[PDB]
Amino acid sequence: SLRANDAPIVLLHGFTGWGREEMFGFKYWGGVRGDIEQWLNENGYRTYTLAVGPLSSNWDRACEAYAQLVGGTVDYGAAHAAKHGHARFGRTYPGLLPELKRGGRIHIIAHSQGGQNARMLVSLLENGSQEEREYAKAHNVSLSPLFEGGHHFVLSVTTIATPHDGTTLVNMVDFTDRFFDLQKAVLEAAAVASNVPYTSQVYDFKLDQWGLRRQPGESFDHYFDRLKRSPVWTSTDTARYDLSVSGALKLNQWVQASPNTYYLSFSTERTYRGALTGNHYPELGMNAFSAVVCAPFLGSYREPTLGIDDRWLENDGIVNTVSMNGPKRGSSDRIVPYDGTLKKGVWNDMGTYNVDHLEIIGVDPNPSFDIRAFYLRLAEQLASLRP
Ligand SMILES: [Ca+2]
Ligand SMILES: [Zn+2]
């Protein structure tokens, strides 16, 4: 379709992810297939990459995304900081797109928990935070323009394999141990070891707010064990919490669709229905870690009281496919299956793809999936959107 808008693309990672200079240059967006930002740019779709805290709360990552985009010191809010016990202020950024302050807009393409992070940034841009505005007045302290409301610079959000209603994987007995083993597998796919105390940061978790950092002489193995016991794994202000079915419910209750923004969901599935009791099993080609450690659980876990029945068993290795088309559990957002015309203010469900959680970003191979073709056709669609 004809190009109707000049808004640039921002790629936003999941509960794992890292900037373009990190991980010795192994891109999260393209992995072993190449560099997805490079593909869109060289095909005339100007594209940028955000890097926020992968284990942090969506709230933290919205404030991190904001500063990273417009430029400034990350401002988590005086109130939120007091309530949860971390720094009000994080890293300073120069700003990728200061023209957002002057009328420029962006399309966000987000993977995994990134789709929650993207939705929430919109909701804060539009409404801000009553509580922050209240707190800034009471204790005579500065307010981020983010908490004010009346901002708007996101023309479209696209979610790819996003736990909008959470993932049942979080309810696994040993999820803690199994989740940081996922972080290690991603490292290994990056050709980075978990048992070597690298001098340089390699993978920065951006836990400035919690005063956490991998230390001189500290391995990722030893660091992850330490993060397991830390507030970025034990508190409600975390990716862990937001990622649970109860986390997404509580997020859905306050993070709604802006009428000024297009939402596209892409769902993923990489499972087959078994004959014995209708459980779901990993297809051939699923990333080894998911196929062994995550999928068997995802595609047999039931809670009939929490609505978690057979619709929840199909999974992309990591997320229950049903959770992906858009928010439902605790949401009044509308979900319309794609009919050739993209609608503002609603979820354009662009369908389910035979592609696993890590294949869809190229962190695992799948020759059957044309990853260049997928991301180009998406950029072409987002460029076609009426502003
Ligand atoms: Ca594969
Ligand atoms: Zn926080």
Author numbering: 2 to 388
Please quote the paper that reports this structure.
5M mutant lipase was derived through cumulative mutagenesis of amino acid residues (D43E/T118N/E226D/E250L/N304E) of T1 lipase from Geobacillus zalihae. Lipase (triacylglycerol acylhydrolase E.C.3.1.1.3) is a class of enzymes belonging to the serine hydrolases and is widely known as important biocatalysts. The active site of 5M is located at the center of the structure covered by two alpha-helices functioning as the lid.
The three-dimensional structure of 5M mutant lipase was solved at 2.64 Å with two molecules per asymmetric unit. The 5M crystal fitted the monoclinic system space group C2, signifying unit cell parameters of a = 117.59 Å, b = 81.27 Å, c = 99.52 Å. The 5M mutant lipase has a total of 21 α-helices and 11 β-sheets in its 3D crystal structures. The active sites of 5M mutant lipase composed of Ser113, His358, and Aps317. A similar composition of the catalytic triad was found in the crystal structure of Geobacillus thermoleovorans lipase. Both molecules in the asymmetric unit were highly similar, and the superimposition of alpha carbon atoms gave a root-mean-square deviation (RMSD) of 0.7789 Å. The zinc-binding sites in both chains composed of residues Asp61, Asp238, His87, and His81 in a tetrahedral formation. The calcium-binding site was coordinated by the residues Gly286, Glu360, Asp365, and Pro366. The mutations of amino acids in the 5M mutant caused the destruction of the ion interactions and hydrogen bonds inside the lipase structure, as shown by decreasing ion interactions and hydrogen bonds number. The mutant also experienced a decline in ion-pair interaction values, having only 20 pairs of ion interactions in chain A and 17 pairs of interactions in chain B. These results explained the loss in the thermostability of the 5M mutant, which also resulted in decreased melting temperature of this enzyme. The 5M lipase has a strong capability to catalyze long-chain carbon and shows preference towards pNP-C10.
